[PDB]
mmCIF file of C-alpha atoms (C1' of nucleotides) and ligand atoms in Angstrom:
data_model
loop_
_atom_site.group_PDB
_atom_site.id
_atom_site.type_symbol
_atom_site.label_atom_id
_atom_site.label_comp_id
_atom_site.label_asym_id
_atom_site.label_seq_id
_atom_site.Cartn_x
_atom_site.Cartn_y
_atom_site.Cartn_z
ATOM 1 C CA UNK R 1 -119.583 -37.353 -79.484
ATOM 2 C CA UNK R 2 -121.322 -35.771 -82.079
ATOM 3 C CA UNK R 3 -121.743 -32.367 -84.259
ATOM 4 C CA UNK R 4 -124.300 -32.088 -86.764
ATOM 5 C CA UNK R 5 -124.205 -28.260 -87.903
ATOM 6 C CA UNK R 6 -127.287 -26.546 -88.075
ATOM 7 C CA UNK R 7 -128.775 -25.614 -91.274
ATOM 8 C CA UNK R 8 -128.008 -22.457 -93.128
ATOM 9 C CA UNK R 9 -128.983 -18.974 -91.589
ATOM 10 C CA UNK R 10 -129.243 -16.956 -94.400
ATOM 11 C CA UNK R 11 -130.360 -13.586 -92.914
ATOM 12 C CA UNK R 12 -128.364 -11.370 -89.621
ATOM 13 C CA UNK R 13 -130.509 -10.086 -87.153
ATOM 14 C CA UNK R 14 -131.327 -7.105 -88.952
ATOM 15 C CA UNK R 15 -133.264 -8.912 -91.543
ATOM 16 C CA UNK R 16 -130.959 -8.142 -94.409
ATOM 17 C CA UNK R 17 -130.347 -11.494 -96.865
ATOM 18 C CA UNK R 18 -127.202 -12.965 -97.475
ATOM 19 C CA UNK R 19 -125.107 -11.765 -100.230
ATOM 20 C CA UNK R 20 -121.809 -13.073 -99.955
ATOM 21 C CA UNK R 21 -120.439 -16.933 -98.993
ATOM 22 C CA UNK R 22 -116.603 -17.776 -98.251
ATOM 23 C CA UNK R 23 -115.256 -20.681 -97.514
ATOM 24 C CA UNK R 24 -112.202 -21.041 -96.717
ATOM 25 C CA UNK R 25 -110.223 -24.670 -96.648
ATOM 26 C CA UNK R 26 -106.876 -25.920 -95.818
ATOM 27 C CA UNK R 27 -106.363 -28.860 -98.325
ATOM 28 C CA UNK R 28 -103.391 -30.670 -96.900
ATOM 29 C CA UNK R 29 -102.153 -30.308 -100.687
ATOM 30 C CA UNK R 30 -103.872 -29.296 -104.069
ATOM 31 C CA UNK R 31 -103.051 -31.872 -105.774
ATOM 32 C CA UNK R 32 -103.830 -34.716 -103.491
ATOM 33 C CA UNK R 33 -107.289 -32.553 -102.970
ATOM 34 C CA UNK R 34 -108.486 -32.331 -105.996
ATOM 35 C CA UNK R 35 -107.370 -36.401 -106.544
ATOM 36 C CA UNK R 36 -110.220 -36.783 -103.735
ATOM 37 C CA UNK R 37 -112.805 -34.068 -105.853
ATOM 38 C CA UNK R 38 -111.981 -31.416 -103.673
ATOM 39 C CA UNK R 39 -113.213 -29.309 -106.261
ATOM 40 C CA UNK R 40 -116.161 -31.056 -106.957
ATOM 41 C CA UNK R 41 -116.948 -30.144 -103.990
ATOM 42 C CA UNK R 42 -116.252 -26.132 -104.233
ATOM 43 C CA UNK R 43 -118.403 -26.608 -107.063
ATOM 44 C CA UNK R 44 -122.122 -27.532 -105.336
ATOM 45 C CA UNK R 45 -121.055 -25.230 -102.411
ATOM 46 C CA UNK R 46 -120.869 -22.308 -105.096
ATOM 47 C CA UNK R 47 -118.943 -19.814 -102.652
ATOM 48 C CA UNK R 48 -118.204 -16.102 -104.294
ATOM 49 C CA UNK R 49 -114.880 -16.007 -102.431
ATOM 50 C CA UNK R 50 -112.886 -19.284 -101.628
ATOM 51 C CA UNK R 51 -109.471 -19.566 -99.629
ATOM 52 C CA UNK R 52 -107.339 -22.330 -99.670
ATOM 53 C CA UNK R 53 -104.028 -23.397 -97.435
ATOM 54 C CA UNK R 54 -101.493 -25.323 -97.309
ATOM 55 C CA UNK R 55 -101.860 -25.198 -101.591
ATOM 56 C CA UNK R 56 -98.000 -27.531 -101.144
ATOM 57 C CA UNK R 57 -97.633 -25.244 -104.694
ATOM 58 C CA UNK R 58 -95.683 -23.284 -106.689
ATOM 59 C CA UNK R 59 -97.237 -20.601 -107.856
ATOM 60 C CA UNK R 60 -96.252 -21.494 -111.897
ATOM 61 C CA UNK R 61 -97.473 -25.362 -110.726
ATOM 62 C CA UNK R 62 -100.651 -25.179 -110.459
ATOM 63 C CA UNK R 63 -103.242 -27.897 -111.529
ATOM 64 C CA UNK R 64 -105.305 -27.441 -114.712
ATOM 65 C CA UNK R 65 -108.398 -27.724 -112.941
ATOM 66 C CA UNK R 66 -107.840 -24.509 -111.560
ATOM 67 C CA UNK R 67 -108.147 -22.757 -114.578
ATOM 68 C CA UNK R 68 -111.771 -24.751 -115.227
ATOM 69 C CA UNK R 69 -113.759 -22.631 -112.007
ATOM 70 C CA UNK R 70 -115.609 -20.155 -113.777
ATOM 71 C CA UNK R 71 -117.647 -18.742 -111.290
ATOM 72 C CA UNK R 72 -114.056 -18.123 -109.568
ATOM 73 C CA UNK R 73 -111.936 -16.347 -112.378
ATOM 74 C CA UNK R 74 -109.295 -13.888 -110.027
ATOM 75 C CA UNK R 75 -106.946 -16.384 -107.997
ATOM 76 C CA UNK R 76 -104.621 -14.984 -106.206
ATOM 77 C CA UNK R 77 -101.736 -17.136 -104.673
ATOM 78 C CA UNK R 78 -98.157 -17.552 -102.418
ATOM 79 C CA UNK R 79 -95.828 -19.808 -101.839
ATOM 80 C CA UNK R 80 -92.588 -20.251 -100.094
ATOM 81 C CA UNK R 81 -89.547 -18.313 -102.031
ATOM 82 C CA UNK R 82 -87.434 -21.456 -100.603
ATOM 83 C CA UNK R 83 -89.444 -24.650 -99.309
ATOM 84 C CA UNK R 84 -90.972 -26.256 -102.116
ATOM 85 C CA UNK R 85 -94.689 -28.951 -101.528
ATOM 86 C CA UNK R 86 -94.368 -26.539 -97.872
ATOM 87 C CA UNK R 87 -97.188 -24.049 -96.586
ATOM 88 C CA UNK R 88 -98.998 -22.513 -100.252
ATOM 89 C CA UNK R 89 -102.356 -20.463 -99.736
ATOM 90 C CA UNK R 90 -104.920 -19.503 -102.184
ATOM 91 C CA UNK R 91 -107.414 -16.296 -102.900
ATOM 92 C CA UNK R 92 -109.959 -17.008 -105.335
ATOM 93 C CA UNK R 93 -112.920 -14.612 -105.957
ATOM 94 C CA UNK R 94 -116.180 -14.742 -108.342
ATOM 95 C CA UNK R 95 -115.402 -10.760 -108.199
ATOM 96 C CA UNK R 96 -112.249 -9.331 -108.269
ATOM 97 C CA UNK R 97 -110.817 -7.413 -105.615
ATOM 98 C CA UNK R 98 -109.642 -3.845 -105.592
ATOM 99 C CA UNK R 99 -106.172 -4.591 -104.911
ATOM 100 C CA UNK R 100 -103.856 -7.556 -103.478
ATOM 101 C CA UNK R 101 -100.913 -7.857 -101.401
ATOM 102 C CA UNK R 102 -98.691 -10.630 -99.539
ATOM 103 C CA UNK R 103 -97.668 -11.108 -96.158
ATOM 104 C CA UNK R 104 -98.114 -9.446 -93.334
ATOM 105 C CA UNK R 105 -95.140 -6.247 -93.825
ATOM 106 C CA UNK R 106 -92.742 -7.954 -91.978
ATOM 107 C CA UNK R 107 -89.832 -9.681 -93.726
ATOM 108 C CA UNK R 108 -89.111 -12.279 -91.276
ATOM 109 C CA UNK R 109 -92.583 -13.689 -91.656
ATOM 110 C CA UNK R 110 -93.497 -13.026 -95.100
ATOM 111 C CA UNK R 111 -90.905 -15.799 -96.510
ATOM 112 C CA UNK R 112 -93.167 -19.092 -96.441
ATOM 113 C CA UNK R 113 -96.172 -18.032 -98.407
ATOM 114 C CA UNK R 114 -98.431 -17.577 -95.776
ATOM 115 C CA UNK R 115 -100.826 -14.988 -96.290
ATOM 116 C CA UNK R 116 -102.851 -13.203 -99.021
ATOM 117 C CA UNK R 117 -104.632 -9.862 -98.460
ATOM 118 C CA UNK R 118 -107.511 -9.161 -100.520
ATOM 119 C CA UNK R 119 -109.570 -5.289 -100.178
ATOM 120 C CA UNK R 120 -112.959 -5.487 -101.513
ATOM 121 C CA UNK R 121 -114.984 -2.014 -101.551
ATOM 122 C CA UNK R 122 -116.336 -2.391 -97.753
ATOM 123 C CA UNK R 123 -114.303 -4.771 -96.199
ATOM 124 C CA UNK R 124 -110.252 -6.355 -96.271
ATOM 125 C CA UNK R 125 -110.229 -9.971 -96.217
ATOM 126 C CA UNK R 126 -106.904 -12.088 -95.017
ATOM 127 C CA UNK R 127 -106.856 -15.601 -95.673
ATOM 128 C CA UNK R 128 -103.808 -17.033 -93.255
ATOM 129 C CA UNK R 129 -101.898 -20.684 -92.448
ATOM 130 C CA UNK R 130 -99.718 -19.401 -89.081
ATOM 131 C CA UNK R 131 -96.840 -21.143 -88.718
ATOM 132 C CA UNK R 132 -97.189 -25.019 -86.786
ATOM 133 C CA UNK R 133 -95.430 -24.588 -83.201
ATOM 134 C CA UNK R 134 -94.234 -27.886 -84.052
ATOM 135 C CA UNK R 135 -94.252 -32.178 -82.595
ATOM 136 C CA UNK R 136 -93.190 -30.892 -79.001
ATOM 137 C CA UNK R 137 -93.337 -27.009 -78.794
ATOM 138 C CA UNK R 138 -89.863 -26.787 -81.060
ATOM 139 C CA UNK R 139 -90.855 -23.615 -83.100
ATOM 140 C CA UNK R 140 -93.143 -22.343 -79.746
ATOM 141 C CA UNK R 141 -90.414 -19.130 -79.941
ATOM 142 C CA UNK R 142 -91.218 -18.092 -83.079
ATOM 143 C CA UNK R 143 -94.950 -18.836 -83.367
ATOM 144 C CA UNK R 144 -95.281 -16.288 -80.217
ATOM 145 C CA UNK R 145 -93.257 -13.595 -82.360
ATOM 146 C CA UNK R 146 -95.397 -14.522 -85.531
ATOM 147 C CA UNK R 147 -98.623 -14.144 -83.134
ATOM 148 C CA UNK R 148 -97.457 -10.665 -82.128
ATOM 149 C CA UNK R 149 -96.417 -9.566 -85.344
ATOM 150 C CA UNK R 150 -99.826 -10.704 -87.483
ATOM 151 C CA UNK R 151 -102.105 -8.749 -84.138
ATOM 152 C CA UNK R 152 -99.943 -5.393 -84.756
ATOM 153 C CA UNK R 153 -100.492 -6.055 -88.657
ATOM 154 C CA UNK R 154 -104.196 -7.236 -88.461
ATOM 155 C CA UNK R 155 -104.748 -4.488 -86.003
ATOM 156 C CA UNK R 156 -103.596 -1.655 -88.713
ATOM 157 C CA UNK R 157 -106.313 -3.095 -91.774
ATOM 158 C CA UNK R 158 -109.104 -2.846 -89.732
ATOM 159 C CA UNK R 159 -108.450 0.341 -88.341
ATOM 160 C CA UNK R 160 -108.685 1.280 -92.002
ATOM 161 C CA UNK R 161 -111.808 -1.103 -93.552
ATOM 162 C CA UNK R 162 -114.393 -3.755 -92.112
ATOM 163 C CA UNK R 163 -111.911 -6.749 -91.598
ATOM 164 C CA UNK R 164 -112.739 -10.465 -91.614
ATOM 165 C CA UNK R 165 -109.755 -12.873 -91.297
ATOM 166 C CA UNK R 166 -109.917 -16.149 -92.341
ATOM 167 C CA UNK R 167 -108.149 -19.387 -92.297
ATOM 168 C CA UNK R 168 -106.247 -22.137 -90.650
ATOM 169 C CA UNK R 169 -105.158 -19.975 -87.211
ATOM 170 C CA UNK R 170 -103.471 -23.224 -85.783
ATOM 171 C CA UNK R 171 -105.201 -22.595 -82.681
ATOM 172 C CA UNK R 172 -107.488 -24.068 -80.960
ATOM 173 C CA UNK R 173 -108.932 -21.174 -78.164
ATOM 174 C CA UNK R 174 -110.286 -22.875 -75.231
ATOM 175 C CA UNK R 175 -110.912 -25.915 -74.157
ATOM 176 C CA UNK R 176 -114.500 -26.910 -76.024
ATOM 177 C CA UNK R 177 -112.370 -26.112 -79.355
ATOM 178 C CA UNK R 178 -110.515 -29.397 -79.835
ATOM 179 C CA UNK R 179 -111.916 -33.373 -78.021
ATOM 180 C CA UNK R 180 -108.339 -33.947 -75.737
ATOM 181 C CA UNK R 181 -107.399 -30.816 -73.989
ATOM 182 C CA UNK R 182 -106.202 -32.297 -70.440
ATOM 183 C CA UNK R 183 -103.743 -34.469 -73.449
ATOM 184 C CA UNK R 184 -103.403 -31.710 -75.306
ATOM 185 C CA UNK R 185 -102.506 -29.073 -72.519
ATOM 186 C CA UNK R 186 -98.315 -28.776 -73.670
ATOM 187 C CA UNK R 187 -98.601 -29.708 -77.258
ATOM 188 C CA UNK R 188 -99.025 -27.966 -80.443
ATOM 189 C CA UNK R 189 -101.384 -26.119 -80.690
ATOM 190 C CA UNK R 190 -103.001 -26.342 -77.864
ATOM 191 C CA UNK R 191 -100.418 -24.693 -75.330
ATOM 192 C CA UNK R 192 -101.383 -21.631 -73.164
ATOM 193 C CA UNK R 193 -98.837 -19.256 -75.150
ATOM 194 C CA UNK R 194 -100.667 -19.481 -78.242
ATOM 195 C CA UNK R 195 -104.319 -20.042 -75.968
ATOM 196 C CA UNK R 196 -103.120 -16.391 -74.860
ATOM 197 C CA UNK R 197 -102.115 -14.719 -78.107
ATOM 198 C CA UNK R 198 -105.465 -15.479 -79.603
ATOM 199 C CA UNK R 199 -107.119 -14.769 -77.017
ATOM 200 C CA UNK R 200 -105.336 -11.947 -77.148
ATOM 201 C CA UNK R 201 -105.981 -11.047 -80.794
ATOM 202 C CA UNK R 202 -110.020 -11.352 -80.112
ATOM 203 C CA UNK R 203 -109.935 -8.332 -77.902
ATOM 204 C CA UNK R 204 -106.642 -6.037 -79.083
ATOM 205 C CA UNK R 205 -107.777 -6.050 -82.647
ATOM 206 C CA UNK R 206 -110.207 -5.945 -81.756
ATOM 207 C CA UNK R 207 -112.321 -9.541 -83.813
ATOM 208 C CA UNK R 208 -114.967 -11.586 -82.952
ATOM 209 C CA UNK R 209 -115.016 -14.944 -83.467
ATOM 210 C CA UNK R 210 -117.869 -15.543 -86.293
ATOM 211 C CA UNK R 211 -119.006 -19.284 -85.185
ATOM 212 C CA UNK R 212 -118.098 -19.468 -81.287
ATOM 213 C CA UNK R 213 -120.169 -16.244 -81.167
ATOM 214 C CA UNK R 214 -123.101 -17.596 -83.199
ATOM 215 C CA UNK R 215 -122.655 -21.116 -80.734
ATOM 216 C CA UNK R 216 -121.514 -20.361 -77.907
ATOM 217 C CA UNK R 217 -121.792 -23.639 -75.820
ATOM 218 C CA UNK R 218 -121.793 -26.252 -79.194
ATOM 219 C CA UNK R 219 -119.541 -28.785 -78.164
ATOM 220 C CA UNK R 220 -117.346 -31.238 -80.938
ATOM 221 C CA UNK R 221 -118.003 -28.689 -83.575
ATOM 222 C CA UNK R 222 -113.456 -29.461 -85.414
ATOM 223 C CA UNK R 223 -112.580 -28.597 -87.998
ATOM 224 C CA UNK R 224 -108.981 -31.000 -88.015
ATOM 225 C CA UNK R 225 -109.024 -34.867 -87.190
ATOM 226 C CA UNK R 226 -105.603 -36.959 -87.123
ATOM 227 C CA UNK R 227 -105.606 -39.093 -89.848
ATOM 228 C CA UNK R 228 -103.335 -41.210 -87.666
ATOM 229 C CA UNK R 229 -105.765 -43.479 -85.643
ATOM 230 C CA UNK R 230 -108.758 -42.678 -88.220
ATOM 231 C CA UNK R 231 -109.517 -39.484 -85.622
ATOM 232 C CA UNK R 232 -111.981 -38.259 -88.402
ATOM 233 C CA UNK R 233 -114.401 -41.454 -88.025
ATOM 234 C CA UNK R 234 -114.315 -40.898 -84.350
ATOM 235 C CA UNK R 235 -114.429 -37.150 -84.035
ATOM 236 C CA UNK R 236 -111.504 -36.766 -82.442
ATOM 237 C CA UNK R 237 -110.893 -33.617 -83.694
ATOM 238 C CA UNK R 238 -109.915 -29.818 -82.926
ATOM 239 C CA UNK R 239 -110.811 -26.575 -84.415
ATOM 240 C CA UNK R 240 -108.490 -24.831 -86.318
ATOM 241 C CA UNK R 241 -110.003 -22.997 -88.775
ATOM 242 C CA UNK R 242 -112.158 -20.093 -88.348
ATOM 243 C CA UNK R 243 -113.260 -16.687 -89.438
ATOM 244 C CA UNK R 244 -112.657 -13.567 -87.392
ATOM 245 C CA UNK R 245 -115.328 -10.780 -88.177
ATOM 246 C CA UNK R 246 -114.510 -7.240 -87.325
ATOM 247 C CA UNK R 247 -117.307 -6.230 -84.345
ATOM 248 C CA UNK R 248 -119.132 -3.339 -86.935
ATOM 249 C CA UNK R 249 -120.146 -6.706 -88.773
ATOM 250 C CA UNK R 250 -121.784 -8.334 -86.515
ATOM 251 C CA UNK R 251 -124.956 -6.752 -87.579
ATOM 252 C CA UNK R 252 -123.823 -8.239 -91.169
ATOM 253 C CA UNK R 253 -123.375 -11.881 -89.692
ATOM 254 C CA UNK R 254 -125.799 -14.729 -91.178
ATOM 255 C CA UNK R 255 -123.758 -17.939 -90.073
ATOM 256 C CA UNK R 256 -120.360 -19.361 -89.483
ATOM 257 C CA UNK R 257 -119.846 -23.020 -90.949
ATOM 258 C CA UNK R 258 -117.940 -26.048 -90.609
ATOM 259 C CA UNK R 259 -118.588 -28.585 -93.370
ATOM 260 C CA UNK R 260 -118.346 -31.524 -91.450
ATOM 261 C CA UNK R 261 -119.087 -33.795 -93.790
ATOM 262 C CA UNK R 262 -117.099 -32.603 -96.833
ATOM 263 C CA UNK R 263 -113.876 -34.844 -97.863
ATOM 264 C CA UNK R 264 -110.817 -34.267 -99.169
ATOM 265 C CA UNK R 265 -108.912 -33.419 -96.639
ATOM 266 C CA UNK R 266 -107.628 -33.979 -92.861
ATOM 267 C CA UNK R 267 -109.331 -29.958 -92.154
ATOM 268 C CA UNK R 268 -112.763 -29.433 -93.504
ATOM 269 C CA UNK R 269 -114.437 -26.841 -95.352
ATOM 270 C CA UNK R 270 -115.809 -23.840 -93.398
ATOM 271 C CA UNK R 271 -118.442 -21.255 -94.756
ATOM 272 C CA UNK R 272 -119.859 -18.023 -93.988
ATOM 273 C CA UNK R 273 -122.405 -15.735 -95.137
ATOM 274 C CA UNK R 274 -122.674 -12.050 -94.569
ATOM 275 C CA UNK R 275 -125.146 -9.782 -95.514
ATOM 276 C CA UNK R 276 -123.344 -6.997 -97.038
ATOM 277 C "C1'" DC J 1 -101.347 -35.685 -80.966
ATOM 278 C "C1'" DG J 2 -104.143 -40.040 -80.492
ATOM 279 C "C1'" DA J 3 -103.699 -44.532 -77.861
ATOM 280 C "C1'" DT J 4 -100.806 -45.868 -73.964
ATOM 281 C "C1'" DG J 5 -100.435 -47.411 -69.681
ATOM 282 C "C1'" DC J 6 -97.659 -44.513 -64.203
HETATM 283 MG MG1 MG B 301 -101.769 -29.805 -92.296
#
DNA sequence: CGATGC
């Protein structure tokens, strides 16, 4: 049915003003996204940090428009070593992070340009494009190994500094997170193994699902719609894109937004407001 | 993976 993202809440349960705006977007290919004017939307959104997934673009063959982005001048990219036109992520920031790194410290999982880590003064930001299980659960064995390695890597990071994880985690956690839970219970993105992995991640690290924490029973809020059969026009979708937070950041959480109407990809952007 | 039609 209907999802209308509520107005932007820019103050925390404390009462402090939001100071940081992070936007995450699976752009389904940088060049296609830019031609659909995705950068015009980003300029209006004016995030402090922009995280992109499925750039599908080699680090050294980036569109020139990305140079023309004045408030996001510190830009870091990662793409597959072997593959091209496949996966790829980016992290663009108004202020320079203290340190950047790539991957999750495990060679097997670090070959596909999926993870960038950006350390800031008071928190560490990870953006991720999580591996897809495959039409029919083909790579679901690999994906369960990814989940375990990813969880271990993130618990490590969170033990040193408060953690914000964002991006396309490629799972709808609960039935409320997709339109057809029944028909997809053996499809990539909604297998019990993927959902259990996600739940493990929440409590093991631990991390809070920022959107679901603020809006525990808001249904029909999705971040992805298959282009097939114009699913988006019908709001037949999945919530695959998240901001997960360390519990210590929850007093900082102002809002977690789903930018339902922003066009340019088969995912829409999500945006996080933190008071730091 | 939404649509389909045991
Ligand atoms: Mg995709």
